Design a protein around this ligand. Sequence first.
Ligand SMILES: Nc1ncnc2c1ncn2[C@@H]1O[C@H](COP(=O)(O)OP(=O)(O)OP(O)(O)=S)[C@@H](O)[C@H]1O
Ligand SMILES: Nc1ncnc2c1ncn2[C@@H]1O[C@H](COP(=O)(O)OP(=O)(O)OP(O)(O)=S)[C@@H](O)[C@H]1O
Lengths: 549, 550
Amino acid sequence: DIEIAQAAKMKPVMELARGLGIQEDEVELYGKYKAKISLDVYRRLKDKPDGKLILVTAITPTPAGEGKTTTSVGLTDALARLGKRVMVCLREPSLGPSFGIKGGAAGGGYAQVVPMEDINLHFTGDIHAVTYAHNLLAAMVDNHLQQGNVLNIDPRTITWRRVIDLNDRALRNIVIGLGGKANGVPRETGFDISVASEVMACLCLASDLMDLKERFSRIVVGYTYDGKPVTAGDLEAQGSMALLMKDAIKPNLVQTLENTPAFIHGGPFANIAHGCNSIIATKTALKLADYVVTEAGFGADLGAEKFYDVKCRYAGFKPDATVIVATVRALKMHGGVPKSDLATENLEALREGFANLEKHIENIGKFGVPAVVAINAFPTDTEAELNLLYELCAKAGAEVALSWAKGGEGGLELARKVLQTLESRPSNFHVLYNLDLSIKDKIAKIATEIYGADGVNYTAEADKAIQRYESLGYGNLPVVMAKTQYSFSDDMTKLGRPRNFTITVREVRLSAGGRLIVPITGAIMTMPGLPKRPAACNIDIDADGVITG
Amino acid sequence: SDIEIAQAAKMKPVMELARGLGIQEDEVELYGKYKAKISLDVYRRLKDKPDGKLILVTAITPTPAGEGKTTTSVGLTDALARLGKRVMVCLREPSLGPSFGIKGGAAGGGYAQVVPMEDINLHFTGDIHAVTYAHNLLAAMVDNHLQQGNVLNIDPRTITWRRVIDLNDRALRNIVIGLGGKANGVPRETGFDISVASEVMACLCLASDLMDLKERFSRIVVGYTYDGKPVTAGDLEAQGSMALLMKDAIKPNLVQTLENTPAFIHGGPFANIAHGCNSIIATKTALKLADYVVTEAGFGADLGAEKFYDVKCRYAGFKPDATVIVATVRALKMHGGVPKSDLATENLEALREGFANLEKHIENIGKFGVPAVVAINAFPTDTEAELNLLYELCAKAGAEVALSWAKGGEGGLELARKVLQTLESRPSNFHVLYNLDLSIKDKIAKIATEIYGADGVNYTAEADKAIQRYESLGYGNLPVVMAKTQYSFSDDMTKLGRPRNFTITVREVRLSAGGRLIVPITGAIMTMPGLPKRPAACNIDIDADGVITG
Ligand SMILES: Nc1ncnc2c1ncn2[C@@H]1O[C@H](COP(=O)(O)OP(=O)(O)OP(O)(O)=S)[C@@H](O)[C@H]1O
Ligand SMILES: Nc1ncnc2c1ncn2[C@@H]1O[C@H](COP(=O)(O)OP(=O)(O)OP(O)(O)=S)[C@@H](O)[C@H]1O
């Protein structure tokens, strides 16, 4: 009965490709229902007009669940119904979690992206391609050391770890290169989940296969003995890294349960990285559709700011609308109601928890972009609970989305407000900070105006880090804040709209292909682990079809 | 010329070739216009139909001078199609790693190639990723189990199951895992072998369908308890999941020769620590779609041909009909003592002396009841006097010259004709070299004695313990898979030719419970090769889309 049990009624992607004016020759199929679209679609429609861009985001995440993706597909079906040319772009899910805790649908209920099972697994192999690009580089680093260490690297400062797309704890901290002189140079490193890879990040912000080629070459792998940074470039790896990505580069065309054309392509981390689907997918989509709907990871404080300040900045996008999702269950949790008690109506809690969404809204304001709230409706979520909220959004447009349950017909109301927004409410999009400010000034501008901290503190380790980067010349880059998503602040316990608090950046990491990363805590969760009773244990496939994936 | 001839190839859509073979559209799964996975439904509905003839191609003891196995197989297949035969060639998928180290070598070679080359050499249909991730999921599961209070009671120090990656990465040979304290796993020594060396890959090649492969996984031994009881993947309830990751990898991939002859590429394991053959699934599907099926085996005939007969044929009921054994003048002369550099110079004496290597392989193939035909892979430097002596010399077997590299199928016409002729007048009487119910040590001697011409076999203490342990754990009625050097009949790689008065030494014996017993000689321990000083990775680029060199 769950979102899986809606495996039913897909149209061959090939014809969809025609329903968009993609030529047959620009389609590399993967069976009938997955295909890869060439980057030629953009290059021949280079100068055509762009359709409108519709970033869906969410309020501060909670154990209550909200529903970005679900609402995003539903936003999409609904626009379909209204005879508009409308595409979605989503992120590809890591394989890892299918076997751990997760194993879920792209969206949900009646607003899903299909075929569900391929998307979760080996899809079109975009992640294996990231994986090999990463590990090849790692290999070249180590081989070089084996080969006499011409570049005079300090093995002890390699910051290039290896990658794999499984929840594997036991690979977090490892020692390689043992066995003697035949078998490499001993050093300490680890693995991270593939999707966390700088290479996954580059895929997602590259203009094209040559932009990818360059960004790879910019990547720092570690430093030499007299502190001079070695690069992917220095190791002549970038060419090979690109070859491995020859196909990953192209976006994947798929569909909605309601046959609405979808791209899913790329999938970065939302803290350590910016957490948007790829730029290739969205700029391509813009030329095939009048209305593109896309999303970002975590809450609008992280995903959206990074959407605007990273993704739009680089790609010359000018977001026209922005939806923000919220649930009643969730806000009550922001009001301080435990996860056990969500069943009960609590109009006073929802009133207090609303402060969260209220801040988020002010932040979408701050970007010169037309906000609109959307509530994913729930079985427990009552009429006085909804009414209390609907009026509480007395500041910016609100609608209810019965999507998870009613399909495109349930996000019919919601899509109206958006289209009314896009016709009557023009945009004035502008990045929050300026790329010539100070790493600190930049962080500060994110902390105060977006989160609402009074100020920012820095550790000893954080300053000699910053120092080095400014003076290594990497100070002109944007800032991608690695912090807990569960609060505006870096204190996860502090839900709602916390006031009179500061932000402390413990460390600073570089991503030379892209931008600058300031961690707030152990965001060190770049490799999660399997649970006591993992899903692998119960996954099976009989003499035909799958139980429990 | 220019062995990226695979550009101008002119490929027929695979779908077209498939319906050409009698495959329905619903049994075809496109990967672009030129690649397809093919349902196991095709075999099922054609189970009752008769097999075509099976032709194995193998070669003489490999050398620095090169021999030409695959080129000859594709070349044969094409020569057969030009003769109007309904034919298929089945080949192994290459590992990705060699592409960035030394190779990125030809689909098959010269005018004998299976294409799309580039994709065959890189991700192809992603069968190797499926193997990598099935294999590592087992590993990750092993570790987490230790991490979760170790109910099954594994001694982590006894875990034989390593990790895997499809790159030449020596630094991953010996590593220490699970560091950082109570939260980060349990410290233990392991390493990574190259993906294609995975037992998960050997299983794929030896499986009959997804259920048997799923079963084979449940028997995989990962380690031992504190008490010495074996612990298996079944015991970790992992086989379902691994099976899941192989849902598509289980289907063979349809592709074509430069001449549009259909071809299957599927699986590609090692030929020492495994049997170096492509998958039973491809081959068995090809026997029902085609009147003739050409396939090959890794290394020389003493290893790959042996294992093809004694492992792959054993499991599948195949009865090989003929065998094409590939040799060159230049390699034979090396075997007769000529150094790599002086190979162009005419030398009928070292040719005569080196022929002993070829003679022996012929003799061996004889021992399975399958008639042999030699293929001479012509080289421009070979004199008439030379080639001619090589024929006189092949006194026992059909001989021919293959010009398959230079002249496509047409160069294979002579060979093709010799095979068809053997097919018609000299039916095989196939039988494996050994019964399963001998002991490990008896089986080994059969192989070492009969096929290597070894005097006998010696064993170290470690070998003796291992064989005693495996036999009492009940794995002693299984086939034996010799991992030795391929550069020699002996396990001294420097003994070329047909060495005599020699002895094999088994140093260490390992178990693959998705099949059988692996017994190593030297450092055939090399299950994770390394990158050279100047790796091909450094001189690879892409521009407009012009993939330069590799
Ligand atoms: N209106 C609804 N009624 C019932 N369940 C819902 C509803 N909306 C979402 N869900 C469930 O909430 C789960 C995920 O909620 P979240 O993870 O907060 O949303 P998300 O992280 O943006 O990704 P999703 O699954 O597309 S909402 C999904 O597995 C859905 O099954
Ligand atoms: N007349 C010829 N001139 C030049 N090269 C030739 C000629 N005939 C054969 N070859 C070689 O045949 C080689 C083909 O190698 P493959 O067939 O891919 O490997 P294989 O021959 O199946 O087994 P190995 O590993 O090479 S011993 C090419 O690399 C060529 O160098």
